[PDB]
Design a binder for this molecule. Structure first.
Ligand SMILES: Nc1nc2c(ncn2[C@@H]2O[C@H](COP(=O)(O)OP(=O)(O)OP(=O)(O)O)[C@@H](O)[C@H]2O)c(=O)[nH]1
Ligand SMILES: Nc1nc2c(ncn2[C@@H]2O[C@H](COP(=O)(O)OP(=O)(O)OP(=O)(O)O)[C@@H](O)[C@H]2O)c(=O)[nH]1
Ligand SMILES: Nc1nc2c(ncn2[C@@H]2O[C@H](COP(=O)(O)OP(=O)(O)O)[C@@H](O)[C@H]2O)c(=O)[nH]1
Ligand SMILES: Nc1nc2c(ncn2[C@@H]2O[C@H](COP(=O)(O)OP(=O)(O)O)[C@@H](O)[C@H]2O)c(=O)[nH]1
Ligand SMILES: [Mg+2]
Lengths: 409, 426, 50, 427, 426
């Protein structure tokens, strides 16, 4: 059993540069990863940093795909003009990666929707993967732009135009912001001046905690097909809040008494979500709890009972059994230079609720304001688009808002 | 990989470009004799963006000097970093225009523009993936403005997809060297609005004012002013030459700062800029760089941005810094000074971080604000232009060369409709 | 100010944070006690019958 | 069973620095937090062999907190527990109760919640504060308000420092004491007074220390608390809990103010030449030369008394000794109460800390009584508070913060009403 | 965290502040270069209150020098610890007021005070939590009195919720350096009673008396006077910089010493201050500090408090001391001399101890007493003001600048009702 990982863009392969560092440091159990990867980007600067880095010999030279020139924060450019010449080479490699494989669980894609490469050719890669395989799962861990913290200007245009394909192509989509992670590193990790490297290190922790069930034998294992049923009650509602516990420094960890009861609680407070949204406004549709390390089924069982009996958070009226647990034996590993201390046990929670319906509504106004005056539209239209797909992507998010409001009732 | 061909025109262009190639050659560690002598590995792998390996480690710049008077060429060849250019690239007329835009655009350009195009073509296809061209000229002179402007139009006809940067200085009435400044600048802008991709506006008032107030220089010759302009140009194309935590090429900045195709006149600033006596009395943090960036008395144009609103803004950072501090600082200035920014655009600030500082510094920054205060100069120019043209002063020096009255009226028309669209979007 | 006042009066009306769980757990335990008592009373009656 | 201890203000967390020092030196834990089961009431165990105290230091000024962060016990306290503000209330009750208090007490509450959640058989809380200041007075009363609405049924042992009659450091402290008692009245279940001049006289005469600083004061306060929690920590021949004092000592829901004392406070030399037994320490616990509040119970009448005994003490003589006290006539009990005593004996002697000025004594008595001499102190406060209030001195600072003239008059008449209440129960 | 921005105005302010920054920097172990060279870690914990780290151990003082003649600015950069101030903080006019309060408050202030305000804003926003501002100036001169007082008024309407100290020497007939001293003092005090939170009265007469008897100096230049004043300023704000058994901050002192919003004029003294001939014969205990503290011949004003009544008093002790001894000494001096204290306030003395002595001594103290005898100065100054103004002396230099006659009558009324209102509470 193996699962291969695709990384797109400046954000994608930097996340991968930390994720693969953790995989090699963690390791027959290796068979699911050893790498079965592909980096691809339009700007050669970040890929060729890997080609000369410490992991020169680790990656086969062909694997590291690199175009000639960047899409430059332009969804249309990275989806219609420049994507068309590189995407064919990428997926015609990924095929022979799958032919190397025999028991493919799925693919997992890493991209940020704000940019052009992460968004544009992300969706383009996804569309040819869906028509080629269809049944095989493709987990997409995307990075959406934050409400108030922002680096680009045209990112609302990109985020809406990317989402229109992220609905019906990916199977399980995990949101991740930058402000929420910045807040996590500021609050729990007490790092007052964080950079992208620290963000990517703890993103890898989440990925590792949800594939450790395939790699190592636990008391209750869970495959990628399991998330497919247990968390998405409707074919078009797959957008997951993420959380992790205990995110804790090296000194505080020894002082505190980490156990199963309190980390099940800590994984539920909005002070520890990976996406800037308040689930107090929403109702939980389903929850999924990956437990790693020193876990007996009793205290995880007792912990979900206390959550259900609390009234600070509510569930939908549909699910009395609104949980999916999972226990694995091997504890989480640490990276030298990393900030997370060694813990006997950790919890990665992936939920689904209606709080996500707020982020789309928040997104709508920013896109709406700019589009009404036709700001920046001339860049995308001359690239090959029209006014049709702007308006039609707009009404797709309008439908999604009504959808969440209907299901939440 | 990505390629930048350099083109310099006129006296202003040649001397600005001379200081430019001095600082770039030092950044890549190339000696005045043309051979590599740097220390870090990082300085080798991205010199093809600016140089060509000839033979025996001879790295010659990919530049084209262009003028009509030999004084500038000989002064270029005389000084250091003067023996690094290919003598075939010194394309050079002989008669001279002399602050007559008509000479540099219809009569004398007609016999030089053929030779420059031959050199720039052979120099363009010599490299594989062109990123764009980079022009440094003026709008007051004749052989800089007129010939350089005509060269911009011909280049955009041949290569319509490739990028185009123009560092152009504009005349102001407080520093007025020639008498026919309005006649030249108005006609030059008429061609810049339709031919260039983006124009980073400069001026001598702000440059002299900057060296007085902030730098506190005693005798600011053209060397120091050209040194400042070169530091801006190195900062704008540091992303191609060095790896960073967030990259932003030329096209990336262009699409994030230009919301409408005719709105491509920028203001520029460089930080940090401190007096030599106070260089050790200061920290080097991101907030300090931001306070000096958003100061209205720090733009390198004589147009106060607080007289209007910013449409967009850009900040290219260099150095080991935390991206969170970058975004928090940009958000902070976006909330406290809410009236100076446009409302129907949230996020008026694009940011980027490169990992290699300029030589000698720890952390630097470059600001490019596309504001609506730039329209004051166009009005500040058009009022002078009408003052002459109501009464046909100096007009015959251009009329007997080919321009008719409709050309000047067309230049007034384009200037007037432009200032109305900046006023519209404010 | 008005929202703050409503917050304080609602805060006093909940009767504390831990109040809801105690009342809930008390009535549940009460359910168990009556069930236990009912069994012993049934046993006595059926023993009397034999 | 567990009890958590919260400290508010400069005097509060300084007292804690002596208490937790005494605790680890008693249970054999190094200041770093590891042993080289009775510690379960105060320390929770990480499971990696590290023990962390159940306490939260909080105040408004960061100076006194951050020497603690860098003393010997940097590694004993969990970092989140040591709360600290940014600017001081500055001897201003209103500033600590409405301006600056409203931002800091909510952080303390959502901290203290998970201390209680880690506990299982929580016996109660116990608070440390000095009413003369602004932090311990202002947000202290605010914290007690929100604690009463949260728990209610749980004990809140208030070990407060009242301003001395004559020896004082601040000038607006009469205002602070009256307004604070107005809420300390109806929130604290059991409130123990600890003056400063009385402790000064004990160290001068008994400990024969002629130059005492605050260190020795805080040291002996920790000794009384240790003597009071030994019954909870360790097993004895006759033990009491913290819920026992709620019933056995306060006859009416508004008369809860106890006079504390301890014996024997004896230097290193008197012990060598002197004898320790139960009868003489039962005597020495009652004489006013060993009380912790400047008042005289000889002027008052006792309602009920309490007696902690530590060390090698049998129960036959504690009964015989308390009998001899009742047959004496220097002190008398209230007519309504025929029996006025609550006795208790525990096996473990008081341990000593190196560097302290307390000798290693074989046996000790901690007396906690209730009387009516406490009514004289409250009246004594009213004379000098009313003295300045009529001319409206120093009122402009509190009213500028957001208060008015109404709360002075209404708090004044409430404590004035308490004066009449004390006089009518004594009759 | 708790922060004090320092402002020095006029010639008097500049010398006082100069000797002040030497004393503090020497306490924190910073050499004239401005780099850290101390040993104890305790000295580093609390340098955010007065300094900013620049780079490589360089600590810059958080001070602003403000004057009108460059003689004072150059005299500051010449002396030692002169190279530590940031040269941009030397905000500075050029013309000169010259002992004319109207010139200091209406003509030259109107163009310099915007500049000094802008520097203060940067210095205030550069830090996080303001504790207050600290202004040192005189009341006789013009560029200190009128401009500094305008700065006080402008700042108080900007940040109204922060404390503010002002240390002001006041004129007296026995030390009469200028001729228009009363015309300056009366108008300055009128603004101080309505703007400043608390003032600390000083005078040059008492300082000369201290240097004669207690110091027994041969040649008391201005350096020694500024030395005494600096020791007082360091002594009062020692509590924020070092921990102690009983800490008392500036706001804690203000609310404890000011019973009514208009009664905020204090007289200050410092101990120990002994000559080198008798410093060898002395002992260092609490009673010897008190009976030298409360001596009338040690006050730094010419207002003998036994000619009035004490409202409140305060003592700030420094060094390892026993708090019992501190309190019993304050009790003894209040019980014996009960008549000198106000009657409707018991325990008139606020006391505090800090555990860091100044360098060169083992134990020290600082006294701040708010007596009612300060009215001797108000009557003593107002009669000289009246003696000229009844006859319109020197008036036209004030009148011809913008001031009219009702300004003097209003100023007279407010000073006169102030001494009347001190007398009523007396
Ligand atoms: N978490 C995380 N996010 C990143 C990182 N780098 C970039 N991003 C995000 O990526 C978004 C922009 O896209 P980029 O990845 O930088 O660039 P791109 O997606 O390759 O698109 P192009 O610039 O056209 O090449 C920004 O909003 C960032 O939030 C990273 O290292 N970690
Ligand atoms: N018994 C005893 N009392 C102390 C000690 N330290 C301070 N105090 C008392 O505390 C009173 C003033 O309150 P502090 O705790 O010092 O200050 P605060 O309560 O935090 O109020 P603020 O100064 O506004 O912060 C003084 O009257 C002292 O009597 C101590 O170590 N032991
Ligand atoms: N910054 C800078 N400006 C220059 C320099 N030389 C000329 N100028 C400006 O150029 C304008 C005149 O342009 P000119 O040299 O006549 O252009 P040309 O004749 O077409 O080559 C004047 O306003 C000068 O201020 C220079 O070396 N540096
Ligand atoms: N203590 C002290 N006082 C000074 C010093 N220099 C000047 N003065 C006082 O300043 C007063 C005159 O004020 P002046 O210096 O002219 O003030 P300015 O012109 O406004 O700056 C005199 O009464 C002096 O006593 C000094 O170095 N130390
Ligand atoms: Mg990119």
């Amino acid at each position: 059993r193996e699962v291969i990982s695709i990384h797109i863009g400046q954000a994608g392969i930097q996340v991968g540069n930390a994720c693969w560092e953790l995989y090699c440091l963690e390791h027959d159990a290796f068979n699911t990863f050893f790498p079965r990867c592909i980096f691809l980007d339009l700007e050669p600067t970040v890929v060729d940093e890997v080609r000369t880095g410490t992991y020169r010999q680790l990656f086969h030279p062909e694997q590291l795909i690199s175009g000639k020139e960047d899409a430059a924060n332009n969804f249309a450019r990275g989806h219609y003009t420049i994507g068309k010449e590189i995407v064919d080479l990428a997926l015609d490699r990924i095929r022979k990666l799958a032919d190397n494989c025999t028991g493919l669980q799925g693919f997992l894609v890493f991209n940020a929707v704000g940019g052009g490469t992460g968004s544009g050719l992300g969706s383009l890669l996804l569309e040819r993967l869906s028509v080629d395989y269809g049944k095989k799962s493709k987990l997409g861990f995307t990075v959406y732009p934050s409400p108030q913290v922002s680096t680009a200007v045209v990112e609302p245009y990109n985020s809406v135009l990317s989402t229109h394909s992220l609905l019906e192509h990916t199977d399980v989509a995990v949101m991740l912001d930058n402000e929420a992670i910045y807040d996590i590193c500021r609050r729990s990790l007490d790092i007052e001046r964080p950079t992208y490297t620290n963000l990517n290190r703890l993103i890898a922790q989440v990925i590792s905690s949800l594939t450790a069930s395939l790699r190592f034998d636990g008391a209750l294992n869970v495959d990628i097909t399991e998330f497919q049923t247990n968390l998405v009650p409707y074919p078009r509602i797959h957008f997951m809040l993420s959380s992790y516990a205990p995110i804790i420094s090296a000194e505080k960890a020894y002082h505190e008494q980490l156990s199963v009861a309190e980390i099940t609680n800590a994984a539920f407070e909005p002070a520890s979500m990976m996406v800037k949204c308040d689930p107090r406004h929403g109702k939980y549709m389903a929850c999924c709890l990956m437990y790693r390390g020193d876990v007996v089924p009793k205290d995880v069982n007792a912990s979900v009972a206390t959550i259900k009996t609390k009234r600070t958070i509510q569930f939908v009226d549909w699910c009395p059994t609104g949980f999916k647990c999972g226990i694995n034996y091997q504890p989480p590993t640490v990276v030298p230079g990393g900030d997370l201390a060694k813990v006997q046990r950790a919890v990665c929670m992936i939920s689904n609720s209606t709080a996500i319906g707020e982020i789309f509504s928040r997104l709508d106004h920013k896109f709406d304001l700019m589009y009404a005056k036709r700001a920046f539209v001339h860049w995308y239209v001359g690239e090959g688009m029209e006014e049709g797909e702007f308006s039609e992507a707009r009404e797709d998010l309008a439908a999604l808002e009504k959808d969440f409001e209907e299901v939440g009732a | 990989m990505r390629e930048i061909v350099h083109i310099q025109g006129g006296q202003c262009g040649n001397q600005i470009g001379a200081k430019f190639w001095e600082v770039v050659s030092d950044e890549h560690g190339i000696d005045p004799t043309g051979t590599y002598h740097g220390d870090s590995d990082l300085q080798l792998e991205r010199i093809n963006v600016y140089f060509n390996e000839a033979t025996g480690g001879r790295y010659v710049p990919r530049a084209i000097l262009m003028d009509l008077e030999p004084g500038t060429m000989d002064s270029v060849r005389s000084g250091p970093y003067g023996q690094i250019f290919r003598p075939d690239n010194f394309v050079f007329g002989q008669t001279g225009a002399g602050n007559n835009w008509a000479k540099g655009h219809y009569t004398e350009g007609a016999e030089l523009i053929d030779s420059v195009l031959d050199v720039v073509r052979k120099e363009a296809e010599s490299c594989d993936c062109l990123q764009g061209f980079q022009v440094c000229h003026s709008l007051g002179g004749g052989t800089g403005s007129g010939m350089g402007t005509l060269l911009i139009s011909k280049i955009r006809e041949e290569y319509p997809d490739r990028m185009m940067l123009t560092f152009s200085v504009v005349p102001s009435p407080k520093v007025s060297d020639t008498v026919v400044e309005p006649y030249n600048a108005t006609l030059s802008v008429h061609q810049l609005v339709e031919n260039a991709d983006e124009c980073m506006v400069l001026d001598n008032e702000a440059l002299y004012d900057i060296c007085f107030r902030t730098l506190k220089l005693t005798t600011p010759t053209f060397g120091d002013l050209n040194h400042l302009i070169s530091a801006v140009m190195s900062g704008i194309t540091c992303c191609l030459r060095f790896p960073g935590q967030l990259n932003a090429d030329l096209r990336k900045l262009a699409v994030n700062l230009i919301p409408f195709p005719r709105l491509h006149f920028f203001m520029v600033g460089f930080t940090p800029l401190t007096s030599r006596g106070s260089q050790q009395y200061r920290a080097l943090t991101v907030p300090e760089l931001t306070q000096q960036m958003w100061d209205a008395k720090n733009m390198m144009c004589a147009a106060d941005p607080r007289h209007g609103r910013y449409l967009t803004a850009s900040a290219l950072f260099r150095g080991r810094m935390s991206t969170k501090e970058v975004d928090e600082q940009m958000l902070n200035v976006q909330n406290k000074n809410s009236s100076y920014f446009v409302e129907w655009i949230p996020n008026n600030v694009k940011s980027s971080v490169c990992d290699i500082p300029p030589k000698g510094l720890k952390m630097s920054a470059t600001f490019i604000g596309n504001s609506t205060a730039i329209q004051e100069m166009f009005k500040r120019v058009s009022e002078q232009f009408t003052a002459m043209f109501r009464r046909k002063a100096f007009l015959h020096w251009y009329t007997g060369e080919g321009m008719d009255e409709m050309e000047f009226t067309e230049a007034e028309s384009n200037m007037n409709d432009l200032v109305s669209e900046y006023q519209q979007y404010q | 100010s008005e929202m703050g006042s409503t917050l304080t009066t609602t805060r006093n009306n909940m009767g504390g944070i831990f109040s809801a769980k105690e009342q809930s757990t008390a009535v549940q335990k009460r359910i168990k006690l009556l069930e236990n008592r009912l069994e012993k009373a049934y046993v006595k009656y059926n023993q009397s019958i034999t």
